[PDB]
Design a protein around this nucleic acid. Structure first.
Lengths: 214, 60, 146, 165
RNA sequence: GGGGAUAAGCUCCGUGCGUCGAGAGGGAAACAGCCCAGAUCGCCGGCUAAGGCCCCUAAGCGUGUGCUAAGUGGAAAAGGAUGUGCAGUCGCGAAGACAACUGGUCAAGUGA
RNA sequence: AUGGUUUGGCACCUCGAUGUCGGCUCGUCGCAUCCUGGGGCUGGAGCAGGUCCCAAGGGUUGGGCUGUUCGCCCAUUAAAGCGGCACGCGAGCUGGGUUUAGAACGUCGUGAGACAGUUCGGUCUCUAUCCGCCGCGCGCGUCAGAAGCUUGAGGAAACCUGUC
RNA sequence: ACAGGAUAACCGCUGAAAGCAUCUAAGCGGGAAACCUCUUCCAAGACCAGGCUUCUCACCCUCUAGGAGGGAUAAGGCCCCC
């Protein structure tokens, strides 16, 4: 069914396709993943596979995590994340200790990359919500960037919740859908994905088969 | 009312029957009997049932 | 003076009510009476000296008229246009226990003591319950003749 | 009501099984199951029929009596010999044929049109212009005939499309 | 009763009319002017008024005979309408009534 | 017959202060639907309309003139909807209009002056206590103390459309 | 977005009361950017405060031993530090 892998955003570069068009590609280190646990309906109520990724010194792991990894039967990894499948038929193709690499995907496939958006800090309504500012001249008094009105006058009497105002921005999980895989370099465990994927370089991402275009 | 329904009788019929039987215990001591001496409350329920008419809905 | 319950005076029992083909309002009223403890001569509105009530077969419950597809359960999220409505039909087919829970909870006082009394109500959509260790007493909704 | 009072004859060759209100009949064509409304009971008349006994004369019962009787009559006549629908086309260029268990029409659309045969029915196509469907239940036959008839919007101007006889 | 568009929670008069003002208590969800009833104080006594008696909430998922399918009950008109209960009429009719298929089959009610 | 979206009528509300129009910024709701969606009859041949139903998810332009709303016009567009909410929104902004004091024209008055007539000019104050809302923490709880990975009751977002 | 579910107006099937008929009172189907799923995100303070696992899994003192209080630790965490 839906495949998936844990990886790292390396950066963006340029390639040219066979028709000489240029393709902006994000390079993802779809490094080797090891299956650490299988979630089954008979035990957990849902079907899922849990993958581990990244390298860490064994002295950096705490005793509970090391115990979980030892019970699974593999050496610890930095990152652990779960892939939600649909049914046990889709869970039967994974077993603990199995190694997942970048070649599970193919050239021209469609993927959904999930990462953590870049942080923006405390942002104003103009940046956080695209509010049009007020005028820069013609008498406007210290309202060049302020939101303006906030509600009604009597019948509202309050501010409706969900009202868009300034606050913290970014640092949220974001999924980009229907990205095309331009090339699957099997030597370096590298995926060439056309477009921009969420997060900063060196961030952790999950690449999954697209849910709409697949 | 709770103790009367525990004896298969409603509060209103029980009060009517107690009034008919002529017993003059007020609701305070009736509740005291209901909580403390259930046997006495059952006996009073019996006498109230005895004092009631045979057809309570009759135009009597 | 009038009797007042002390610390260890309250004693609780377990009842189970089979909701199969029982009118929703009737069962809800009976269960509310049992939960409040109104059937005990030692009742006190101050105290929750009620009993534990188990309701099984909640999906088999009886609803008269066309209330199955014409009575709505409402809830507002707090956001504008946050009003959601489900009829008793889909509410029964999705969350069978919720109909009985809502009906019973609407019939007991809305104080903090009512919130405490709510904790002693368990409803189950199946014919069985996990409370066999308490040995519940089967309960029948009877009417005292006057 | 008047129809409801008349018992519907049961042929000797059809096995009729009555379990409360759930009624099942095993005819030469096949078996079809019916449920009778609660206020009106059905008992197999020993003289080779069944009894449509309506005990009350309240509006619901007096209205359901004839309905139940005619439903049972339709059931028996559908389980002995089945039911058959006869269809045809009017116009030019409209061709129809049966592709195994599925039906394929060419009304002139940019795409071929497929019709799926549900259980209990079969498709008869002796000519492109005229074809037929038969089944053991009248209701499914009627519904599928209506569905197949709907393949063209009505034409009060020229009359191209399909129509019942 | 007048004025106003007999509209106003409009205004102006009459009333051994009431209440509030200056009146607590009970009821009407809340509710100066509506209903019951006029608080000297105390009581962990009783009987009632208005209003009530499935649960919230004290007391009836009261009894008997009927009606309603509209959640009517639990807001509204002109008007529209093969809903239904009861009662009253008339027309036609076993010489076979109505429907269905002036004459034939058929089989009790059929029409306003 | 509805409505209080129009002018009204009453003066119960405030004169020990309830900002008066448009515009900007930001909304939210109704459907009496402008486009897109689904149908019905056509005095519908097709196209295209007429007209009537259902439908509120999203969308619904930029300019000239005027302080304007309104309006007329210019280019477009799938379309350039109608309304409620102190005719939403000045402890969010403006001050062009109206509504002080200066000055002038016409008209009225003997005159001081006046004109729901015109004309030019003319101070828009405040460090947010509480509720509300947008974000971020601290404490306790979840029947020992911890740590990974999670299910989701329940909510929020998004929903447009053209040409070939 | 695709797909599914239940529907609006509407199109119907099988037919009673009302011997016929009648998309209807019994039923069964189709049917929309509306509704429920479906897509993305938050979410157990969800007080019914959930689940699957893994780690520690122990040591004293005091009053009167009924409970409490105090101290020292483990797994782990925080402060200081880059």
């Amino acid at each position: 069914a839906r495949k998936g892998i844990l990886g790292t955003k390396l950066g963006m570069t340029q390639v040219f396709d066979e028709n000489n068009k240029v393709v902006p590609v994000t390079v993802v280190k779809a490094g080797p993943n090891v299956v650490t646990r299988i979630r089954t309906t008979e035990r957990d109520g849902y079907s899922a596979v849990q993958l581990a990724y990244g390298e860490i010194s064994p002295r950096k792991v705490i005793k509970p995590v090391a115990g979980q990894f030892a019970a699974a039967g593999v050496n610890p990894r930095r990152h652990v994340a779960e892939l939600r499948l649909d049914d046990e038929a889709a869970v039967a193709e994974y077993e603990v200790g199995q190694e997942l690499t970048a070649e599970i995907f193919s050239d021209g496939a469609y993927v959904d990359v999930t990462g953590t958006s870049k942080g923006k800090g405390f942002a104003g309504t103009m940046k956080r919500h695209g509010f049009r500012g007020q005028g820069a001249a013609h008498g406007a008094q210290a309202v060049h960037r302020r939101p303006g009105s906030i509600g009604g006058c009597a019948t509202p009497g309050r501010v409706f919740k969900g009202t868009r105002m300034s606050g913290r921005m970014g640092n949220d999980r974001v999924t980009t859908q229907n990205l095309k895989v331009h090339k699957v370099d099997a030597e370096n465990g590298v995926l060439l994905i056309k477009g921009a994927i969420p997060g900063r370089n060196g961030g952790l991402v999950v690449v999954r088969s697209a849910i709409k275009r697949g | 009312n709770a103790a009367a329904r525990a004896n298969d009788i409603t509060y209103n019929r029980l009060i009517q029957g107690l009034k008919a039987a002529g017993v003059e215990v007020d609701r305070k001591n009736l509740a005291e009997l209901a909580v403390s001496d259930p046997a006495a409350f059952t006996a009073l329920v019996d006498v109230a049932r005895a004092a009631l008419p045979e057809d309570v809905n009759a135009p009597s | 003076p009038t009797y007042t319950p002390k610390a260890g005076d309250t004693t609780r029992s377990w009842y189970v009510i089979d909701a199969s083909d029982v009118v929703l309002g009737r069962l809800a009223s009976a269960a509310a009476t049992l939960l409040r403890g109104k059937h005990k001569p030692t009742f006190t509105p101050n105290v929750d000296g009620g009993d534990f009530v188990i309701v099984i077969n909640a999906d088999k419950i009886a609803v008269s008229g066309d209330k199955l597809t014409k009575k709505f359960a409402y809830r507002h999220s707090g956001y504008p246009g946050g009003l959601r409505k489900r009829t008793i039909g889909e509410l029964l087919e999705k969350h069978p226990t919720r109909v009985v829970e809502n009906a019973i909870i609407g019939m007991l006082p809305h104080n903090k003591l009512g919130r405490q009394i709510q904790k002693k109500l368990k409803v189950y959509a199946g014919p069985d319950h996990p409370h066999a260790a308490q040995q519940p007493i089967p309960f029948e909704i009877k009417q005292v003749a006057q | 009501s008047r129809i409801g009072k008349q018992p519907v004859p049961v042929p000797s060759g059809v096995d009729v099984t009555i379990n409360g209100q759930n009624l099942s009949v095993k005819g030469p064509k096949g078996t079809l199951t019916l449920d009778v409304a609660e206020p009106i009971s059905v008992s197999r008349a020993e003289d080779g029929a069944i009894v449509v006994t309506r005990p009350d004369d309240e509006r619901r019962s007096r209205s359901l009596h004839g309905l139940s009787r005619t439903l049972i009559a339709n059931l028996v006549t559908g389980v002995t010999e089945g039911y058959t629908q006869k269809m045809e086309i009017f116009g030019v260029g409209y061709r129809v044929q049966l592709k195994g268990q599925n039906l394929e029409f060419a009304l002139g659309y940019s795409h071929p049109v497929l019709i799926e045969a549900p259980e209990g029915i079969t498709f008869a196509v002796e000519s492109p212009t005229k074809f037929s469907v038969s089944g053991i239940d009248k209701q499914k036959v009627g519904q599928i005939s209506a569905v197949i008839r709907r393949l063209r919007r009505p034409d009060p101007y020229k009359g191209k499309g399909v129509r019942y006889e």
